[PDB]
């Protein structure tokens, strides 16, 4: 044919079933703090009324200086972040040298406009991508948030912050009001976990901070020294945070 | 044209357009109410839904429609706040022209007749399944006299000699999580628990339905009845004793 | 106009609200019901089960009632339904006999019924299905031992007097009706047509899932009603769990 | 029948005609908030047919009588027929029975009015109220304010929270007060607040206009306290506006 | 093209015929320390009449895994037999058997592929229970994992799970007695209950029939591997119950 | 037969990188006029889903190459992709031949692009191209920029009326330009009739958006003349906005 | 029993028949309204089409219904001219009853009542879309005195703000030119040549209006009014102003 | 596989893409007529294209010379005409340079109605092309008689027209109506192309989707004219002229 060195390809050909094809509803949101970015989701889903899960993981990060967490039915989404590790992964293990930003970007709008068939019929995944780009000029600005439509148009916010899900018109009048409180990854992941509060204040679907269970909201921050994972007690004491003082 | 000294049947003949005659509105409730020795309690969470957005967080759906009874409703908030209140109003309606109190069957049937004349309006949505709770002054035995009865969308009534039940979205949740805690009631306070708890349960697997908010301090609202009446249990004893499950849940 | 000397009819001339007229431009339902004839008696029985789909939303539902003294009624359909045809009609019979004096003839107290129930056609095409079976005792019959009686009525009113000796009606009905197609030689007399008719319901629940059978846990048992030449009587509880008992223990 | 001193009531016997019962222009964003001593109330100015901007002057917030003030969002033709009718039922019961309405009265009033429109907002002629009123006979002057919300099928409901909204940019409205009430402490406080609110659903949603400096175009809004309901002068708000958009630049 | 060494790709390239394309019943499964149970209903109903009061619907798939399946009856027969030629071909054929969570992979690709079947009432709705033997701690081994129609697979963390028509029930039961589990034998014990209090709410859920004496089947896995519990076991186990409800 | 054609050339190999066929966001306007030695195109950059709006910054016309340029209203992601895979089409086309497409041939090739989208556009994504170019193998360098547009079906039409619009604003634009052309006698005449017909485009469509005098953002334009195609720089079009605002009001 | 004193309230009282409402009928026009110092003009084309075909090219639109006011209407031909007639009628009938004209409002009102009134059959077709225009006698400052008033399906009315306004099939077009040309309007002559010149830009662009028919001789109708009262402008007026227009495209 | 030497049937085998089919509210409408004269024959058309009621173009040109000796005007969707026109002028002399032959005219028919057939499906869809040729045939027999006019319906279906002038589009109706009563005035190429530029006017007095001469913007129906010599365009200046005169005559 023409190689592309793409996974999705050779899997589709080769092993198409291999290929993704009701629970569903999440609250994912992102924002850029000076030469950082972060990002968080909730652990709620939900068949209609009743809620089928609560310690869902809807946040991964996909390889060194990117994350993506994905909204919509969960199957569909928990699919869609392993698929597309793989799938840079693969490239630069047959290049030997990993995808320019702007790379990875197409390739997940491309598996994003090929879904829109399904998309159509429920099987809707929309994904929010956060990226720190070590190209880029300013590592400042090195932060990348994107966000996708169903039909793969993809768009990168100069705005400082986004959110996606049932929840995310919530989320984003919440950060619209705290980003100017943002100074530092620190006060970032307090606005972000606040914006999801908000959203589950607002939204049955978007589950909020289990002090019953103490399941939180799980969160990947990004700098010049790549992709981690917060640890869940940081995150469980910003919420105590915001509750405290929220019934003050 | 007999005089059945009914209020709704007499709005029916010359006022139409005050009865809630019928031809995403919000909803989402659960109603729950037990059998105790000697007494009746019902409760009902706070929450209203219009899809997925939280329309309502305040909502009371539990009323005191006479001195020894009380009505939670389910379904359609619109469509059951007025029909606790007419119902409140045919009651103590026939009450004044009679100058005595409806037995307790009477009762029912009039709630029946409401419930089944709205089956039409109800088939577009316009739903309200009523929980009809009340102590019988009249029945021999007073600590049996607790009733609890159901309705179904036709007009069916059920008296539940189980001595619980529920009716709204969670209310299978509530249902069988008091399955599990009926034996533990043994007096008015054990079973306003046991109602708070079912009701936290049904708040803990239904969306729909809104558990207590400790944030905004805000509780399923509760009514008990025994012999001496019905009574709106206070809202600081409703909050001890959901801390008290919380507290005992982690 | 004319006077029937019908409490239906003055509901329907002048409170419409009140008779179950509920049609219009799940609800529970489900149950099985059985009738036989004995020498000089009938008796009749029915299940206590009602379901919503496939939940269980009742357990003790009676669906067997005295409606005079010498007539019972067993509804099997919507639950509502049924329930209210039940109390209509009693008070119907009532009625007619407190202002003429005298009760309806056999004959006349079926084609009452037969009207209400051809009246609810329209409702029963979308769901709210009563369909009635009447047993009852003719004091005016010839012969006491044949006086015994028992109507069946499909949807449009049609009734139709059972020649065979026994009848059912409801969810369970074939399987009741096969099964006393082989037990009813077996039957002499109110107490073995008792047994024989807990039996048919016995078989009926253990084919059909919306038909409950003898709940020992909870001890919920059929209901039935026995009617000679003495009048309708409720049978206790516990012959009936007596009966069920020996039923169960003969099965196994 | 029964006479209830109802108006709606009267004309349906009398006048059926004169009763009420696409696209047509519709869209809008109300907001109204409590501030200690007072409630206030404001509106957009804009009215779509799809995406064709067909109104820019719309007035959506309404003086119904001297302690009330009704919003209404919706198909705008059914709205403003509505805000007229009100008012003078809420009159016309005052003068046959010499006294005015209980504020509960009010509110069941308009309930009635609402609900009977459910035929008709199923089929787009669709009317959302929000009512703010002062209650006289409230025990405190404080907590006299009021705010009450309708579903389309005449379910009301009473603040407890303290703000509310209704209309297309509703929910940018309440998540923005959501924030910003904790700094209402007086009525220009709590007015810089609603206007604020109604700028940010402005932003978000394109149904709601926002002020227009070119043509001088500004919400409108109505403050009420135990003095009565008052119209806030326009002047009062586009300064409010320029506040806003200064302090955003 | 590339081998995975599945008779599932196997049969669709060669033998699409053999490939799979009467329901209600209750499943449930929980975790003990050091073990894992499951155990299932044996009625069948079509409408409201009951087809079959003897079905099994559990099945040992492994040693160290067992599938329930709720639906319909055939297709979840099928389903079980396939499921367990799967994981023993590639134990033939790479020597080694499959990580637990390649088994998950391989059960989640093969209710995905049945997606459009349960659109059109060919619905078979798996839960799978394992033990993991290369798990870091042995107490927290057992494994429990459900499927929604779409193939999405979920690893219990709620330390018990249903699926089914009398689901529900059976789930808030478990919520209430899991605390009393302790071992084996209580969690056998909940599980027991659990779909009693199922079949008494679910009418197309049967619970023990005494005349006949069927009763649930039921499943246990600890580290020495998975073993059907004999009927009498549960037998026991169920009157229990029904004295004790009284 | 082989057209060197990178589109058809990905049909063959390639067609998972195709638009393909069978809310998003939309909602754009575009204008373009032509002004002695050049021609000049602008468009919003307002995305709206319903009556939300999803999107602020949206740039909607592009550089294709040294001498034209197009301005995609419609669904925002067709849009984009439209306009970066013609662009690719055309330099494609330049390397295989070693001489870029005649301006007739560039026309053609969009055409197709568009009318092999129609299925597509009956679905909603929709995607109405504008194309502005200048001719240097034109006889005439004054009358040389020509405006082009599409209709659904790949129909094309070369105005000669003088200016263009697309977009869900553009009927405003349009007879807002009717009345200000003849004020057009250079790149900087023509460029303020641009910006002030995309202005009266956004007055009366609420789909369109105009100055955001707060966040500081404004239309993007294009101007192309015989020296080849240049991004307008945002201050001369912030300047040129503030002017007709300004304007509006008083003075 | 209420009397209005409205004509039209007694026509469906006692002859239901003559009203309007019924159950590709000829439609299309496109008229304007713009408001000048001390005045207020109005005009209309003269096109009827089905479909493609031109059905009519003489009809007027635009009628004087009172003395300080006239009706342009946009939508089916029969409707339109109905609805003209009966206005006028509505109007002198109030005055003859009660002895003095309608308040301006009062008359706005009783015209959205009859387009209301219309919704019904609008919906299948029978549309009829009004624009007002009228000078108020009342008003306190004559230079401000003439109104403009457009009507929606639904009869919801707007008082215009801005100065002028159209409808019907070429009225975005017409908008837009006025908007240009608006500041051009000092007295009666220039807002007079401002609305002609606004139907001939949407006579240009949109092919259900009919722009001025120089071989036949056929040309917008207008009307203006000011302090004065309505009057018909005379044809020749017109079309000198449209050659003026013509002649200046060219 | 057998060569017809159809450039149709090369794209249809390898470059479909290519092919206007796109059969899986668009700018449309002009009435286009064609009459026979002496040794001649003459087809005009209307400018304009409508989408609904809004004039899309004005300048529209949809009479084209397609080969020395034939002319094709094409009424209805217009980028369809479009593509037809350029389409159909490639066949021919692609036919042509392979076999060093024209086609017969009966040969150039049948390929036109060949393109119009396999447009079937879209046409139903809205894509419609109704083209009408117009055409000298060199082989004829007297040269008087040697001028063709062939009208196609939407499936392909040809006819060739005894009468002496034809029309299609929106105004056809008209045109034709003027024809018959203008054609007895046709004796030359010269009346010939009156009679044409007239019926036009006439169309577009009665059809809005029609243009008729536009004398503010000098926009005028485009004709061509073919006799013996070949096909020639109608200068602008001459049929402006034919315009004013008839405008003239017309008022006066």
Redesign the interface.
Known sequence: ??D?SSFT?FLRR??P??LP???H?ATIVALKYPGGVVMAGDRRS??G?????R??RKVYITDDYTATGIAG????A?EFARLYAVELEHYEKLEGVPLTFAGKINRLA?MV??N??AAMQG?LALPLLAGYDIHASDPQSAGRIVSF???????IE?EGYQAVG?GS??AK??M???YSQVTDGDSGLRVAVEALY?AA?????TGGPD??RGIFPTAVIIDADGAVDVPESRIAELARAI?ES??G
């Open positions: 044919a023409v592309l390809d080769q092993a079933e291999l094809a009701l629970p509803g939900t068949q009324n009743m809620i089928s899960g310690d869902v039915t969960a199957a569909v928990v491309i406009r090929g829109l068939a099987l439509d169903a039909a793969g148009g993809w768009n100069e049932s018109l919530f009048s919440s619209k009001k705290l908000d204040d607002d939204d049955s679907a002090l019953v509750i929220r019934s």
